[PDB]
Amino acid sequence: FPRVKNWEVGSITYDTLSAQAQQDGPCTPRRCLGSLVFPRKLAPEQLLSQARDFINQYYSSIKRSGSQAHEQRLQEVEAEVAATGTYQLRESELVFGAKQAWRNAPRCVGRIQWGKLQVFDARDCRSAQEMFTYICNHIKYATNRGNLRSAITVFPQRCPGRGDFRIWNSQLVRYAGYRQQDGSVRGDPANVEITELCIQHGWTPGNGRFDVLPLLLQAPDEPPELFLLPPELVLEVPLEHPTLEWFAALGLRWYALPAVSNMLLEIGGLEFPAAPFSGWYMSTEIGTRNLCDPHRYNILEDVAVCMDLDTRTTSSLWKDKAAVEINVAVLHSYQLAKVTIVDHHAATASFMKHLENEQKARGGCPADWAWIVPPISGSLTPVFHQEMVNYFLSPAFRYQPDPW
Amino acid sequence: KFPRVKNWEVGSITYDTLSAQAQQDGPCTPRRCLGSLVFPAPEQLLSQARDFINQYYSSIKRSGSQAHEQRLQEVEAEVAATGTYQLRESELVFGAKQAWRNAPRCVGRIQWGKLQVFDARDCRSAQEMFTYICNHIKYATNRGNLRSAITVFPQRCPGRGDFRIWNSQLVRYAGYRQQDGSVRGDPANVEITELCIQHGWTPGNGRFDVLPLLLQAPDEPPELFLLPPELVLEVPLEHPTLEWFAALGLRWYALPAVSNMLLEIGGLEFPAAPFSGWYMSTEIGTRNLCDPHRYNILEDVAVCMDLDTRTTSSLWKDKAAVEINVAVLHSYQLAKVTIVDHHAATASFMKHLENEQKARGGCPADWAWIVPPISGSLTPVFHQEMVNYFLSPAFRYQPDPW
Numbered sequence: 053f054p055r056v057k058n059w060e061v062g063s064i065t066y067d068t069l070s071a072q073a074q075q076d077g078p079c080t081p082r083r084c085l086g087s088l089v090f091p092r093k094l095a096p097e098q099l100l101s102q103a104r105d106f107i108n109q110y111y112s113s114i115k116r117s118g119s120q121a122h123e124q125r126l127q128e129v130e131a132e133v134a135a136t137g138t139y140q141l142r143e144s145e146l147v148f149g150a151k152q153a154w155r156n157a158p159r160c161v162g163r164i165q166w167g168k169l170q171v172f173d174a175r176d177c178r179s180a181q182e183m184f185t186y187i188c189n190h191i192k193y194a195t196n197r198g199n200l201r202s203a204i205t206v207f208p209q210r211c212p213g214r215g216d217f218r219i220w221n222s223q224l225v226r227y228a229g230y231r232q233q234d235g236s237v238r239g240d241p242a243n244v245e246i247t248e249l250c251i252q253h254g255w256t257p258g259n260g261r262f263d264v265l266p267l268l269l270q271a272p273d274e275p276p277e278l279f280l281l282p283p284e285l286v287l288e289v290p291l292e293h294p295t296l297e298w299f300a301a302l303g304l305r306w307y308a309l310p311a312v313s314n315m316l317l318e319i320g321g322l323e324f325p326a327a328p329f330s331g332w333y334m335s336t337e338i339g340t341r342n343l344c345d346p347h348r349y350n351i352l353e354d355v356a357v358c359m360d361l362d363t364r365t366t367s368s369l370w371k372d373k374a375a376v377e378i379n380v381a382v383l384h385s386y387q388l389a390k391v392t393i394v395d396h397h398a399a400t401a402s403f404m405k406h407l408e409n410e411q412k413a414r415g416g417c418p419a420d421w422a423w424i425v426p427p428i429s430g431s432l433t434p435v436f437h438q439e440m441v442n443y444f445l446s447p448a449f450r451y452q453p454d455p456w
Numbered sequence: 457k458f459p460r461v462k463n464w465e466v467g468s469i470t471y472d473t474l475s476a477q478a479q480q481d482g483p484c485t486p487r488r489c490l491g492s493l494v495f496p497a498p499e500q501l502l503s504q505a506r507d508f509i510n511q512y513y514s515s516i517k518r519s520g521s522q523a524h525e526q527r528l529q530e531v532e533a534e535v536a537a538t539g540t541y542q543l544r545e546s547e548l549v550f551g552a553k554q555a556w557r558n559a560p561r562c563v564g565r566i567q568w569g570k571l572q573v574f575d576a577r578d579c580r581s582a583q584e585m586f587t588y589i590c591n592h593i594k595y596a597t598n599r600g601n602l603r604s605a606i607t608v609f610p611q612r613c614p615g616r617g618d619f620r621i622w623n624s625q626l627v628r629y630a631g632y633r634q635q636d637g638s639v640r641g642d643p644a645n646v647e648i649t650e651l652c653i654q655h656g657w658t659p660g661n662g663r664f665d666v667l668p669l670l671l672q673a674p675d676e677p678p679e680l681f682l683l684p685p686e687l688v689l690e691v692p693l694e695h696p697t698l699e700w701f702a703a704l705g706l707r708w709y710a711l712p713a714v715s716n717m718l719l720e721i722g723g724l725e726f727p728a729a730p731f732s733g734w735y736m737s738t739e740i741g742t743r744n745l746c747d748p749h750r751y752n753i754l755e756d757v758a759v760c761m762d763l764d765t766r767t768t769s770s771l772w773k774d775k776a777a778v779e780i781n782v783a784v785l786h787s788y789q790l791a792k793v794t795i796v797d798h799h800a801a802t803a804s805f806m807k808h809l810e811n812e813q814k815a816r817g818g819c820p821a822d823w824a825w826i827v828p829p830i831s832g833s834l835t836p837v838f839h840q841e842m843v844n845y846f847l848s849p850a851f852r853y854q855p856d857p858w
């Protein structure tokens with residue numbers, strides 16, 4: 053049982069939940085690989101063992117372990133797999149597992165919200181036109197005129213026998229990335245590849261550096277087809293600064309809804325390759341990572357020139373000063389547009405509260421320090437001084453290969 | 457079967473073949489990562505020794521020669537007869553540099569080859585120990601043009617106790633418990649401060665009182681030594697454009713000199729071997745002054761800056777912290793005291809990573825300690841995956857002698 057200390061307060065706890073960790077991560081006694089983004093690389097007897105485990109903690113979470121339907125639900129799954137090789141989740145189990153996956157996500161700092169999650173069951177979907185309509189309900193429900201609500205849509209599980217629902221975009225809302233004669237990009241460089249596949253599947257390329265891409269939706273077997281997102285469904289925030297009047301003229305925008313559409317949800321040994329989930333942004337994601345990373349929009353220098361900062365020397369801290377104001381403008385712009393956003397101080401403080409809750413509830417919490425600490429002002433947030441244990445629990449969101 | 461390591465800013469990919477030689481085991485398992493934890497006979501002495509002598513005779517491009525094989529035979533002979541062995545001076549200098557080179561949380565290792573090694577292994581008492589330390593501080597400080605240095609006191613040896621420096625650094629500010637239950641000065645130094653007082657030190661009452669040295673000779677109680685004021689170069693803090701900042705009365709010292717770690721070379725242990733470099737500005741501005749459990753000045757500065765501290769989304773913390781760091785850099789440059797900012801320091805560490813990949817096939821690096829505590833992803837080490845493992849020679853933690 054690892055001893056975990058908070059250096060700001062001096063308090064000590066023990067992570068007993070780590071003992072119950074299963075799918076081993078990347079580290080060994082000889083070397084630590086915690087800083088790697090994708091760890092390592094990406095007879096149905098093993099299906100019954102994960103299904104029974106998952107069914108077990110479901111009845112634990114409603115008191116009703118011991119006698120009653122708990123005994124009985126164990127049989128249906130045993131029979132369902134003996135007869136078919138797989139099994140179907142009861143609607144509430146699918147809800148419980150979807151929330152557990154989010155609760156167990158070590159890299160997510162917003163897990164204080166894990167109990168409030170809207171789970172659309174799209175398991176009877178059997179068409180790429182049908183998915184699109186599901187995806188559009190979600191986006192409309194999640195966005196909710198800017199009062200964001202966390203939501204996930206669960207498309208049908210993978211079944212042995214040829215067939216996989218899949219979204220090809222990494223997110224539901226992505227900005228285009230246009231190569232050109234320099235090789236340099238106009239738009240989002242992280243989306244150069246998918247902008248390529250969008251064009252080579254028919255898409256009409258666009259204007260400039262903030263063009264919402266079309267979706268590439270893939271019903272089982274039959275190849276992907278292009279779908280266009282209606283402009284009124286993609287809510288976007290133009291970026292302005294409360295006191296730097298020229299900032300709006302930079303023409304910067306970002307969208308309202310962060311909706312990850314390329315991870316695999318795994319519940320009780322079942323695999324859902326299309327299960328797009330969505331929440332609301334923390335502002336450093338937009339201001340710091342999306343707009344200021346050198347391999348993203350890389351705007352830092354341009355904002356510094358406008359601020360008349362001494363870009364001739366690193367010791368002026370001109371990068372730090374410009375980055376803060378970008379984050380100021382992001383927070384101001386989403387607020388002025390009445391769009392849910394959370395600053396990194398508010399988020400980390402709520403995560404500490406989530407840590408304390410989980411200590412009482414489950415005796416610990418998996419957390420990946422490197423992703424929990426924000427990308428600016430790290431030691432100014434309370435999570436920086438909190439030691440954390442990282443390990444994999446199920447149900448979980450997992451990374452999955454790409455459909456090409 | 458070597459870890460594959462990507463840089464995400466640029467797309468580079470390397471493989472850390474050196475991690476395979478990891479000569480000790482850390483806290484992680486496949487079940488759980490513990491990377492974020494701050495604190496993670498004759499036949500084994502012989503194999504550590506044999507591995508160090510091999511390293512030394514590789515570096516002078518003389519591997520497997522007779523000189524090499526003689527030294528190996530010399531060492532195990534000396535281990536049989538005495539239970540231990542003595543390093544030659546050249547082996548000691550190499551071992552001190554390798555320990556710095558091998559330290560995974562050090563962002564300043566581009567400098568590892570430029571280390572001045574003072575051999576104090578003939579030291580005999582606490583009083584001579586004090587003299588060696590003053591020389592070290594004076595040489596390393598160098599009137600503000602700081603030079604990296606280490607002084608090595610005698611090794612742990614059967615029969616006799618250890619030399620120990622009780623202070624965690626050569627220069628520390630006193631931390632006094634208060635009436636408010638609070639602390640006056642640096643809260644990290646409350647313990648050593650109480651130790652000093654009860655060993656005869658007459659305490660001050662300011663926020664920046666330099667502490668005396670508590671120096672332990674073998675099988676002796678610790679002895680109290682005062683540092684001459686003119687040996688401790690200090691820097692008052694001011695801001696280039698916030699002129700009320702100078703009225704805060706803030707100071708920090710020039711020389712960061714860690715004095716409580718154990719230096720390990722070929723199985724030999726040096727419990728007293730203080731080493732010093734120069735500060736990176738975030739250690740002072742962000743951690744020492746802004747940590748809530750340190751001087752905790754962040755809200756004071758922000759209030760004075762007329763920031764809106766009612767709400768966190770004004771980012772008043774980030775703005776105050778940036779300006780405190782600006783003041784640190786400006787102040788040290790004005791005082792003509794060496795200092796590096798986190799951008800220049802992380803850029804030079806990236807170069808170190810590239811030098812090390814060509815030389816040894818990799819580099820032990822602790823990401824959470826290499827990435828600076830402000831502006832993390834604005835520096836290039838943020839997007840560099842790293843591999844953390846323990847090589848020897850090494851600086852190691854040790855328990856406090858009290």
Ligand code: HEM
Pocket residue numbers: 150154157158159160161162165169202203204329330331332333334337394399423449
């Ligand atoms: C409600 C507000 C939420 C906030 C503020 C938030 C914030 C974040 C942030 C900042 C990360 C860091 C990873 C990165 O930057 O790429 C993250 C990771 C993650 N989030 Fe959340 N999130 C929220 C909701 C959700 C929801 C609703 C789900 C799923 C149902 C979710 C699942 C995940 C997962 C699986 C990761 C792991 C990322 C990875 O492994 O690459 N989050 N979250």
Ligand code: HEM
Pocket residue numbers: 552556559560561562563564567571604605606731732733734735736739796801825851
């Ligand atoms: C000359 C410029 C130097 C710079 C800019 C520098 C910077 C740093 C920084 C910023 C850290 C992490 C700070 C912390 O623990 O909070 C660190 C750790 C460390 N440094 Fe360096 N350092 C320098 C010189 C040296 C020298 C001369 C030595 C020894 C010969 C050394 C050995 C170490 C060790 C062993 C650690 C690990 C501490 C631990 O495990 O907690 N450094 N350094």
Ligand SMILES: Cc1cc(N)nc(CCc2c(F)ccc(CCCN(C)C)c2F)c1
Pocket residue numbers: 089162310311312329330331332333334337
């Ligand atoms: C639901 C949600 C809330 C929020 N605040 N932000 C996002 C986008 C960031 C993000 C995540 F959080 C989680 C996962 C991914 C994809 C994996 C990212 N890795 C592998 C580069 C992501 F890109 C999503």
Ligand SMILES: Cc1cc(N)nc(CCc2c(F)ccc(CCCN(C)C)c2F)c1
Pocket residue numbers: 494564712713714731732733734735736739
């Ligand atoms: C030589 C030097 C240069 C520089 N730039 N900073 C320092 C002080 C920080 C620091 C180190 F670097 C190395 C070691 C310690 C002590 C270990 C503290 N561990 C538990 C966080 C330290 F506190 C020393």
Ligand SMILES: C[C@H](O)[C@H](O)[C@H]1CNc2nc(N)[nH]c(=O)c2N1
Pocket residue numbers: 059436437438439440492493494824825826
């Ligand atoms: C809990 C956490 O690992 C701890 O507070 C670390 C994080 N990274 C750090 N990095 C540096 N350079 N110095 C520190 O003191 C710390 N503290």
Ligand SMILES: C[C@H](O)[C@H](O)[C@H]1CNc2nc(N)[nH]c(=O)c2N1
Pocket residue numbers: 086087088089422423424464838839840841842
């Ligand atoms: C190499 C390193 O692990 C990588 O750059 C990580 C670090 N921490 C991160 N943290 C968040 N929230 N998002 C990221 O993309 C990353 N990138």
Ligand SMILES: [Cl-]
Pocket residue numbers: 310337342
């Ligand atoms: Cl994003």
Ligand SMILES: [Cl-]
Pocket residue numbers: 712739744
């Ligand atoms: Cl320090």
Ligand SMILES: [Gd]
Pocket residue numbers: 360
């Ligand atoms: Gd101007």
Ligand SMILES: [Gd]
Pocket residue numbers: 697698699
């Ligand atoms: Gd002024």
Ligand SMILES: [Zn+2]
Pocket residue numbers: 079083084085086484488489490491
């Ligand atoms: Zn690890």
